[PDB]
Amino acid sequence: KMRIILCDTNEVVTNLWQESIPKYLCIHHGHLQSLMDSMRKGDAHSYAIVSPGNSYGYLGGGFDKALYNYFGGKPFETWFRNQLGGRYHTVGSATVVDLQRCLEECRDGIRYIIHVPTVVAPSAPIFNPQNPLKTGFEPVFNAMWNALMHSPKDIDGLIIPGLCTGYAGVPPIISCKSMAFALRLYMAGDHISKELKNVLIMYYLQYPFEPFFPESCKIECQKLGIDIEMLKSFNVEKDAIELLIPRRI
Amino acid sequence: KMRIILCDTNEVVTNLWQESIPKYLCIHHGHLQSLMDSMRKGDAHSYAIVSPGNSYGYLGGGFDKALYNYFGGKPFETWFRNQLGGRYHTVGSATVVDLQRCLEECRDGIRYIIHVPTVVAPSAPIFNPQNPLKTGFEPVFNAMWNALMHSPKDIDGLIIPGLCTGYAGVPPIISCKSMAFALRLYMAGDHISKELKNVLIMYYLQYPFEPFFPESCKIECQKLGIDIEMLKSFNVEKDAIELLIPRRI
Numbered sequence: 098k099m100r101i102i103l104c105d106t107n108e109v110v111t112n113l114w115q116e117s118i119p120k121y122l123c124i125h126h127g128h129l130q131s132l133m134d135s136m137r138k139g140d141a142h143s144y145a146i147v148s149p150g151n152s153y154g155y156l157g158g159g160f161d162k163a164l165y166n167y168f169g170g171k172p173f174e175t176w177f178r179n180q181l182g183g184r185y186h187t188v189g190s191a192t193v194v195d196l197q198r199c200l201e202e203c204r205d206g207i208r209y210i211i212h213v214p215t216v217v218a219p220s221a222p223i224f225n226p227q228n229p230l231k232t233g234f235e236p237v238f239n240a241m242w243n244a245l246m247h248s249p250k251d252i253d254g255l256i257i258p259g260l261c262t263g264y265a266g267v268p269p270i271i272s273c274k275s276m277a278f279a280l281r282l283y284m285a286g287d288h289i290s291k292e293l294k295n296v297l298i299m300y301y302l303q304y305p306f307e308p309f310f311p312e313s314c315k316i317e318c319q320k321l322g323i324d325i326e327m328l329k330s331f332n333v334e335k336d337a338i339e340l341l342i343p344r345r346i
Numbered sequence: 347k348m349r350i351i352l353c354d355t356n357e358v359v360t361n362l363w364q365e366s367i368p369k370y371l372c373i374h375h376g377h378l379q380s381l382m383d384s385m386r387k388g389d390a391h392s393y394a395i396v397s398p399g400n401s402y403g404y405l406g407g408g409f410d411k412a413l414y415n416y417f418g419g420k421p422f423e424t425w426f427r428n429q430l431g432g433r434y435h436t437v438g439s440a441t442v443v444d445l446q447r448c449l450e451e452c453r454d455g456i457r458y459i460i461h462v463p464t465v466v467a468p469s470a471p472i473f474n475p476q477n478p479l480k481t482g483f484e485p486v487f488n489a490m491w492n493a494l495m496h497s498p499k500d501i502d503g504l505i506i507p508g509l510c511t512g513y514a515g516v517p518p519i520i521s522c523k524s525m526a527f528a529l530r531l532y533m534a535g536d537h538i539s540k541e542l543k544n545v546l547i548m549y550y551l552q553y554p555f556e557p558f559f560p561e562s563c564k565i566e567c568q569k570l571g572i573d574i575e576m577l578k579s580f581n582v583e584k585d586a587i588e589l590l591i592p593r594r595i
């Protein structure tokens with residue numbers, strides 16, 4: 098129903114998206130601006146744009162900069178930061194900014210910006226090859242999961258760029274995988290219970306805590322064709338997402 | 347106006363709280379249960395309890411366990427998890443659960459539980475001495491900041507235990523410092539602009555990004571008696587919070 102548009106100027110990101118994801122979803126290699134211009138020859142449709150930002154709402158670089166240019170520059174940034182309460186928002190949070198208030202700056206079919214801080218400030222990458230899990234796989238998944246969970250149900254399409262793949266410095270190979278996983282859970286709809294999705298996330302993030310693996314979910318894995326042994330030993334650095342969410346689903 | 351009650355069974359945590367914090371705030375060494383029993387000889391008052399939990403809302407250990415016992419055990423946990431949508435909530439998020447619905451389980455003057463996930467699951471500590479900042483100072487500050495920002499404005503008191511100091515495995519000496527800082531910013535009220543607080547957080551977390559340090563905040567530091575040089579070089583492991591928020595304020 099809701100179209101998901103993955104947009105990014107880095108072909109490495111777009112190529113990786115093509116590989117890890119099975120209409121309902123579209124991939125666009127190129128600038129957001131052009132995708133927007135391109136978004137004027139179809140409906141002759143309201144969207145929300147996920148933007149990986151900083152904890153303060155400044156839009157001085159990366160994807161945020163495209164948003165800054167496209168929506169009115171420095172007055173828009175000023176307005177934007179005020180919508181966020183002008184204060185610190187933690188990485189792990191997500192805030193929807195309604196552009197409808199433009200009527201009090203309006204443009205195209207974009208009504209929302211889902212602000213998801215990926216860095217406190219771009220003073221240094223968040224990534225550390227010593228632990229690609231805590232500084233890569235996990236933060237990207239969380240940012241994607243929150244953006245999806247916060248997506249207004251009234252929109253026609255959701256525009257999302259690579260997350261943490263710019264100033265945050267997370268390798269695309271790592272980010273794309275977590276984005277693909279979050280999206281795969283979301284697209285599984287009700288074919289997988291919420292509880293089982295919770296369990297799949299827990300093992301994907303390598304937190305093998307048995308007490309949080311209910312028997313009902315074990316029965317559901319057997320019914321869905323998910324190998325429980327491989328689930329309990331899922332290694333985010335070597336195993337395919339398919340082992341958690343079979344495409345047959 | 348709003349009373350803040352720091353409660354914890356670990357005397358190391360309570361002792362450290364005494365040292366890093368200057369009525370409006372109370373410290374209680376002891377079990378939450380007894381503080382609640384104690385909370386019946388004063389008003390002859392509605393509170394909110396901050397609870398450091400996991401991403402799934404299970405209440406099987408630590409402070410959450412006290413909540414589990416006190417509010418109805420396994421039916422309460424079941425109800426609690428449903429209030430959270432029965433799904434994954436990221437570390438960095440905060441969700442207020444209204445116990446008012448008890449009338450459809452009601453007890454004392456507690457109306458809210460501010461659920462702040464500090465771990466995905468208690469399968470291992472989140473702390474790593476290799477980087478006490480990214481795995482200690484920062485996550486504790488974020489959890490405290492969010493709990494405070496999410497505190498309902500209608501409550502009389504806010505009950506908070508040590509955050510990340512149990513199953514998360516963050517040393518009290520580190521956690522208490524970040525909790526003290528978050529609380530010091532909050533208690534500074536309007537005596538410090540929101541923007542300056544943003545800057546103090548940024549440097550406290552060691553993200554020295556100059557472009558995010560507005561000139562107006564520099565002028566405000568000079569006016570408030572804050573040494574800008576020491577701000578730009580604040581070292582969370584060696585410098586006193588006082589250097590960021592002078593007690594004279």
Ligand SMILES: Nc1ncnc2c1ncn2[C@@H]1O[C@H](COP(=O)(O)OP(=O)(O)OC[C@H]2O[C@@H](O)[C@H](O)[C@@H]2O)[C@@H](O)[C@H]1O
Nearest residue numbers: 106128129149150151158159160163215259261263264265
């Ligand atoms: N105009 C654009 N169009 C499409 N994609 C873009 C554009 N500009 C950047 N991108 C892509 O968007 C992705 C996101 O990178 P960033 O914007 O840098 O975000 P990430 O979390 O790394 O970093 C966010 C941080 O960087 C700051 O610019 C931003 O304010 C925030 O503090 C990258 O894969 C990048 O190639």
Ligand SMILES: Nc1ncnc2c1ncn2[C@@H]1O[C@H](COP(=O)(O)OP(=O)(O)OC[C@H]2O[C@@H](O)[C@H](O)[C@@H]2O)[C@@H](O)[C@H]1O
Nearest residue numbers: 355377378398399400407408409412464508510512513514
């Ligand atoms: N009954 C109690 N009364 C007062 N303080 C208590 C009590 N039980 C524990 N505490 C204190 O509360 C603090 C919080 O520790 P945890 O509850 O373990 O929480 P922290 O983030 O480490 O870990 C949360 C994680 O542990 C799990 O139990 C919980 O569900 C979550 O997954 C500690 O300083 C601990 O001494």
Ligand code: NA
Nearest residue numbers: 149159160161
């Ligand atoms: Na950005």
Ligand code: NA
Nearest residue numbers: 398408409410
């Ligand atoms: Na707890």
